[PDB]
Amino acid sequence: SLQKLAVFDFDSTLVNAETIESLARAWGVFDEVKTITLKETDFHKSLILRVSKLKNMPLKLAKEVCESLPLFEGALELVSALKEKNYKVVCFSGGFDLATNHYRDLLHLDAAFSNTLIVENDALNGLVTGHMMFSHSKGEMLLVLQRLLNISKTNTLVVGDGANDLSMFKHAHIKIAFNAKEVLKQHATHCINEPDLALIKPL
Amino acid sequence: QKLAVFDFDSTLVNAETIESLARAWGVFDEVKTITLKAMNGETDFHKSLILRVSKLKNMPLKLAKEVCESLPLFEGALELVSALKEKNYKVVCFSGGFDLATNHYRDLLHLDAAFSNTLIVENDALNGLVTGHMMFSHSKGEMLLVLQRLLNISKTNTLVVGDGANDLSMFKHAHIKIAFNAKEVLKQHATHCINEPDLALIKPLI
Ligand SMILES: [Cl-]
Ligand SMILES: [Cl-]
Numbered sequence: 365s366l367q368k369l370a371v372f373d374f375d376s377t378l379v380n381a382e383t384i385e386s387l388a389r390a391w392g393v394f395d396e397v398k399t400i401t402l403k404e405t406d407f408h409k410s411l412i413l414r415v416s417k418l419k420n421m422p423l424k425l426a427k428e429v430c431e432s433l434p435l436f437e438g439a440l441e442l443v444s445a446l447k448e449k450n451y452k453v454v455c456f457s458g459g460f461d462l463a464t465n466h467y468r469d470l471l472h473l474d475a476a477f478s479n480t481l482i483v484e485n486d487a488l489n490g491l492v493t494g495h496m497m498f499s500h501s502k503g504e505m506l507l508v509l510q511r512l513l514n515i516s517k518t519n520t521l522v523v524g525d526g527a528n529d530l531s532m533f534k535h536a537h538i539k540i541a542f543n544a545k546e547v548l549k550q551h552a553t554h555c556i557n558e559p560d561l562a563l564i565k566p567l
Numbered sequence: 568q569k570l571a572v573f574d575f576d577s578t579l580v581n582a583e584t585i586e587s588l589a590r591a592w593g594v595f596d597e598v599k600t601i602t603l604k605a606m607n608g609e610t611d612f613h614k615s616l617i618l619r620v621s622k623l624k625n626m627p628l629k630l631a632k633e634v635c636e637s638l639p640l641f642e643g644a645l646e647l648v649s650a651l652k653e654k655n656y657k658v659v660c661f662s663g664g665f666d667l668a669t670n671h672y673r674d675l676l677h678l679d680a681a682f683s684n685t686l687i688v689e690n691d692a693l694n695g696l697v698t699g700h701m702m703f704s705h706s707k708g709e710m711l712l713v714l715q716r717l718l719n720i721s722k723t724n725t726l727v728v729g730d731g732a733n734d735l736s737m738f739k740h741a742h743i744k745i746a747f748n749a750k751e752v753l754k755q756h757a758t759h760c761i762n763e764p765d766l767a768l769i770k771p772l773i
């Protein structure tokens with residue numbers, strides 16, 4: 365019945381929060397992490413530097429913070445509506461799977477691809493590696509999935525909010541800029557300026 | 568709808584990605600020492616990988632790609648892929664190695680996918696750093712799980728082929744576990760062993 369692919373960004377798309385930040389202030393280093401943005405932004409260095417600010421953070425805490433992010437309204441509703449229309453629903457995140465694994469199960473996403481916060485003796489050791497370590501990581505994984513599930517660009521829908529989602533926007537027919545930054549809105553097929561994911565259903 | 572997953576180093580290609588590069592760059596003994604120890608409980612897979620890659624610093628990317636695209640396939644390679652696809656098998660490759668190589672073979676054998684690690688590049692030369700998907704010895708297993716859930720394919724319909732201990736992770740979630748000219752440790756949890764450097768020998772099992 366026609367197989368389709370839907371990919372969601374995580375931070376500020378599914379959850380009305382930025383994982384690395386909620387993590388930062390939970391450990392009391394938000395004011396430092398907030399300023400770590402190296403640059404035409406270097407996503408890789410910025411990310412690994414912020415993560416290091418988390419050295420020694422106990423895992424139970426990090427896991428608690430990551431599994432408690434607030435979702436945007438319509439989240440579940442949107443995802444169920446997509447699945448009932450033969451959509452494979454996936455989530456891409458420059459964030460971490462402590463977060464993405466939880467929401468993948470909660471929203472019944474078919475898959476989630478993010479990075480891992482390396483743990484040593486029950487605490488974060490400040491290191492990170494994974495699927496989304498570079499700024500063009502989403503576009504790449506999208507091509508991977510399309511070739512894997514054998515779904516075309518024409519049958520792909522993408523939803524994100526930041527500059528980082530551009531690499532994903534390139535290989536999609538439907539591009540939704542959800543409460544997005546100027547750069548992303550300007551390449552979108554549709555813009556949603558209201559904090560409710562259900563608004564996307566009419567699509 | 569079935570799933571067939573292949574290990575890369577010493578399973579699809581009769582070579583070990585990391586050392587071919589090490590020697591091609593002249594840091595073979597250093598890497599060799601480290602490859603050992605790792606196989607002999609001294610250091611975990613993760614630190615090994617990171618340490619062995621640092622020995623590749625400054626290596627031209629073009630030369631690195633060239634070496635990675637020159638690895639000798641195992642005889643019967645294309646045969647099996649072709650055979651598997653007829654039996655409605657989604658052919659995928661897992662590697663604790665690098666996509667610079669697995670991406671080439673992925674495209675050559677037209678595999679549906681290939682999941683590896685990445686060699687960071689700075690000013691057209693290897694950085695000495697690596698990051699990615701398969702950086703831990705339990706990585707392959709965890710990825711197989713993600714795959715099974717994504718495609719909605721059961722373990723019963725999963726066929727795995729590997730040669731090393733690192734492959735025990737994806738063995739634990741497979742019905743058909745194949746040890747291709749493997750180490751005894753993998754042979755132990757195996758379901759079929761192939762002690763012949765010929766990959767078409769798996770066809771009778773598919
Ligand atoms: Cl992101
Ligand atoms: Cl980057």
Ligand SMILES: [Cl-]
Pocket residue numbers: 576661662663664733
């Ligand atoms: Cl490996």
Ligand SMILES: [Mg+2]
Pocket residue numbers: 373374375376377524525526
């Ligand atoms: Mg975002």
Ligand SMILES: [Mg+2]
Pocket residue numbers: 574575576577578729730731
């Ligand atoms: Mg091997």
